[PDB]
């Protein structure tokens, strides 16, 4: 009878804002190549278009990427950027 205004906790199912996506790109550049290697594979998991290219190049498109991948990128970068300084 009335929408409950659902507030979900769907990591891999939430639409990410342009602001979030923007931060994602920043957070990825905040990662060194050593750690970038994982985020590359995270994308490749869904994106065979990246695999189509050379893994030297990261291929990300924050628009056609799904929350499943986008959030997983975030989840990784954010785990690395938690930092002993932000969290002592």
């Amino acid at each position: 009878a009335s929408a409950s205004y659902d507030s979900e906790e769907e990591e891999e199912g939430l639409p990410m804002s342009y602001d979030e996506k923007r931060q994602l790109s920043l957070d990825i550049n905040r990662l060194p190549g050593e750690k970038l290697g994982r985020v590359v594979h995270i994308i490749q998991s869904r994106e065979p278009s990246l695999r189509d290219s050379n893994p030297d190049e990261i291929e990300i498109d924050f628009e056609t990427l799904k929350p499943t991948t986008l959030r997983e990128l975030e989840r990784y970068v954010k785990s690395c950027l938690q930092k002993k300084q932000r969290k002592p």
């Binding site: 030297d56 990261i58 498109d61």
Partner: peptide, 12 residues
């Protein structure tokens, strides 16, 4: 000439 929110690693 502006690209959408994408990012390359290394070269282009």
């Amino acid at each position: 000439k502006v690209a959408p929110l994408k990012i390359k690693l290394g070269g282009f």
